[PDB]
Amino acid sequence: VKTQRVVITPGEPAGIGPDLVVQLAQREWPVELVVCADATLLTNRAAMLGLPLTLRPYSPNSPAQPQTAGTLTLLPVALRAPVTAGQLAVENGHYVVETLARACDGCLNGEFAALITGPVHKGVINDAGIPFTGHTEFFEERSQAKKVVMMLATEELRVALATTHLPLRDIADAITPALLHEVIAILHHDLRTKFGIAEPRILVCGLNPHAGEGGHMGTEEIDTIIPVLNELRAQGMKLNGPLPADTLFQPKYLDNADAVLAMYHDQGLPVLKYQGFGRGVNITLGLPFIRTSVDHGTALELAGRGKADVGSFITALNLAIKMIVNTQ
Amino acid sequence: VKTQRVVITPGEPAGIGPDLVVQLAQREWPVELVVCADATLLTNRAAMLGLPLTLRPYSPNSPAQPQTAGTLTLLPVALRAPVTAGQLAVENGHYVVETLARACDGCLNGEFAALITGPVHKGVINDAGIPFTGHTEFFEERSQAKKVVMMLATEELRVALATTHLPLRDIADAITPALLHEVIAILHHDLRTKFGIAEPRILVCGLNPHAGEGGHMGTEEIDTIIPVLNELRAQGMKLNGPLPADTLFQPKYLDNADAVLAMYHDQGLPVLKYQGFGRGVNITLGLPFIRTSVDHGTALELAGRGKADVGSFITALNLAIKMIVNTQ
Numbered sequence: 339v340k341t342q343r344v345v346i347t348p349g350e351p352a353g354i355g356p357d358l359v360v361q362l363a364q365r366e367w368p369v370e371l372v373v374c375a376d377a378t379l380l381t382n383r384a385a386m387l388g389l390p391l392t393l394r395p396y397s398p399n400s401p402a403q404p405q406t407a408g409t410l411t412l413l414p415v416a417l418r419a420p421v422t423a424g425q426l427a428v429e430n431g432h433y434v435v436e437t438l439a440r441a442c443d444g445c446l447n448g449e450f451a452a453l454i455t456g457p458v459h460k461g462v463i464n465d466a467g468i469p470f471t472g473h474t475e476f477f478e479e480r481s482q483a484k485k486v487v488m489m490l491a492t493e494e495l496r497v498a499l500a501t502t503h504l505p506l507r508d509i510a511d512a513i514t515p516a517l518l519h520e521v522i523a524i525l526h527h528d529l530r531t532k533f534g535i536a537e538p539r540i541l542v543c544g545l546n547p548h549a550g551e552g553g554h555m556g557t558e559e560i561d562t563i564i565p566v567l568n569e570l571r572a573q574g575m576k577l578n579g580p581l582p583a584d585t586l587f588q589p590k591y592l593d594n595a596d597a598v599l600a601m602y603h604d605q606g607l608p609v610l611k612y613q614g615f616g617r618g619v620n621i622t623l624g625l626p627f628i629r630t631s632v633d634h635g636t637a638l639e640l641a642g643r644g645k646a647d648v649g650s651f652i653t654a655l656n657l658a659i660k661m662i663v664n665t666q
Numbered sequence: 667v668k669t670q671r672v673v674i675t676p677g678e679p680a681g682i683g684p685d686l687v688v689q690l691a692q693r694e695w696p697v698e699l700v701v702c703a704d705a706t707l708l709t710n711r712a713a714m715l716g717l718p719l720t721l722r723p724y725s726p727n728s729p730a731q732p733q734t735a736g737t738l739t740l741l742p743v744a745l746r747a748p749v750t751a752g753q754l755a756v757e758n759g760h761y762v763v764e765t766l767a768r769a770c771d772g773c774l775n776g777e778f779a780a781l782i783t784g785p786v787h788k789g790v791i792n793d794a795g796i797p798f799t800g801h802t803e804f805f806e807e808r809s810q811a812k813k814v815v816m817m818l819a820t821e822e823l824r825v826a827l828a829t830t831h832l833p834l835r836d837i838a839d840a841i842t843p844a845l846l847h848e849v850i851a852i853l854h855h856d857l858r859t860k861f862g863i864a865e866p867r868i869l870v871c872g873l874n875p876h877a878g879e880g881g882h883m884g885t886e887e888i889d890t891i892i893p894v895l896n897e898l899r900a901q902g903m904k905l906n907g908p909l910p911a912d913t914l915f916q917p918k919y920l921d922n923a924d925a926v927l928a929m930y931h932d933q934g935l936p937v938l939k940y941q942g943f944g945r946g947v948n949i950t951l952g953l954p955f956i957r958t959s960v961d962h963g964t965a966l967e968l969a970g971r972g973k974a975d976v977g978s979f980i981t982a983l984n985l986a987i988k989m990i991v992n993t994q
């Protein structure tokens with residue numbers, strides 16, 4: 339058994355990502371933590387927080403070593419400008435993108451067994467003149483990925499999104515048998531080859547309230563959702579639904595599921611966040627590599643202060659680690 | 667003080683409403699429970715359930731008296747045909763609607779402090795040639811209500827819906843300033859006049875994920891929601907601007923708010939359903955009187971069997987009582 343390596347991108351320097359990473363470093367880890375970021379950034383922030391940090395260099399041509407408490411391994415990318423916690427900085431936009439580009443490739447190459455990302459600020463990135471829609475779009479394109487799927491998981495509750503950040507008004511047309519087949523395939527595949535579930539049991543939400551109540555609140559379940567499930571169920575895939583989302587989200591139903599397929603953003607996330615502030619993880623399915631992320635944003639306001647909550651990041655790390663195990 | 671009267675309509679005689687009312691009658695009550703139903707119907711169901719029941723006649727020309735355990739007060743209405751649990755009898759559709767009419771007028775004329783409804787079967791009512799768009803629409807109409815707002819509550823969380831049963835594709839255009847202005851007005855009005863919450867605190871969801879995230883993920887928050895909210899804030903209403911639905915159901919917000927206002931069905935009820943077990947209550951806002959209701963169907967299958975579950979009915983009644991006492 340060879341010790342594995344994982345790359346972490348704290349993301350937005352002015353954000354709380356660097357803080358959270360310093361806290362992560364305060365413990366033992368079965369894998370080596372290769373943090374792609376500015377050393378000075380990590381050093382100062384650590385200092386402000388009052389937490390000891392010791393960076394050791396990324397040595398690719400050497401056996402990997404589990405990261406020991408108070409330490410992290412470094413894969414440097416330099417800040418384009420100095421950093422003051424709490425205040426953004428347009429140019430650091432290229433820095434954030436740099437570390438994201440370096441980490442992705444590392445996983446595309448094979449240097450790292452997984453990528454766990456910290457919160458980034460899109461705005462600042464775009465203002466710096468860089469085309470950026472979010473991590474899930476960045477890693478998707480840079481990997482030449484046919485299509486991915488987003489998931490937010492806690493422990494026993496995993497929710498997948500057929501469509502993501504689309505205005506409410508454009509959802510209906512977006513859900514087509516084409517979208518659904520690609521989607522469920524990647525979901526079912528990954529629940530098996532990543533989460534290690536032999537026979538994944540997916541619950542499926544209907545597009546409409548009450549799953550369209552057949553005759554009344556919509557025909558999308560009759561025209562595209564049901565036919566596709568009828569196909570995949572016949573292929574031995576276990577798919578329960580379309581079910582009204584406000585019936586499906588009960589333990590009587592959940593305690594017998596491996597995951598939930600929500601048709602859109604607000605149909606599945608509200609219950610998840612409610613279910614776990616800390617513990618949630620966003621996992622990108624479909625990517626040519628294991629990638630998880632936190633469930634929160636940059637929280638500039640709390641940066642450098644000394645109060646964080648690495649709960650999500652830690653969870654995203656642990657899960658990234660388990661997936662390694664189930665994918666090795 | 668004086669004892670308050672509430673009126674309860676068990677509803678469809680063949681369903682669980684009657685079993686439920688008998689069950690709720692096994693404990694003491696701070697108010698007189700005037701049940702608008704058939705005497706023999708309640709007594710038979712109580713005997714089949716092995717539960718004691720002693721009816722005393724409703725007598726308006728007398729002081730109300732807190733209901734004693736094992737008893738109920740009765741506002742008689744003759745069934746049209748005998749009743750057999752689990753079997754719909756169309757001639758009895760007139761009985762059901764007659765109890766709704768009687769309880770309704772009772773509330774409208776000051777006889778009763780509130781109305782608490784058990785499940786009703788629309789199918790059998792229409793089958794008897796009786797127009798019935800719905801249980802809550804019936805009261806909406808009999809009381810010349812300009813408009814009603816549906817709320818789902820759990821004695822811990824209150825969720826109002828700007829729009830209910832509509833195909834997902836129709837919500838976007840359905841949310842006009844006109845609709846939103848009114849819905850909020852009634853919500854705010856009733857939290858104050860029916861819940862007794864002087865100066866109510868309301869959290870409003872945005873229509874799109876991330877509440878629009880500027881104008882790059884939905885233009886409605888800018889086009890109609892925020893404009894309507896600012897105006898309403900001028901009126902002195904404490905409205906907490908369009909928030910992302912996925913992060914609104916966090917304790918930091920909920921614990922310091924009196925109600926949430928979702929733009930649509932699946933955006934607000936799933937959390938409510940998840941955090942509710944069965945204690946979900948249906949509250950109809952905008953009527954000239956207080957009205958609470960169970961969050962379930964008639965369950966003909968369970969009728970008479972003895973294994974109902976009075977969770978919803980007890981909450982509905984306890985909530986209606988809390989509302990009464992909190993507004994005397």
Ligand SMILES: [Zn+2]
Pocket residue numbers: 503603875876
């Ligand atoms: Zn999102």
Ligand SMILES: [Zn+2]
Pocket residue numbers: 547548831
């Ligand atoms: Zn509904």
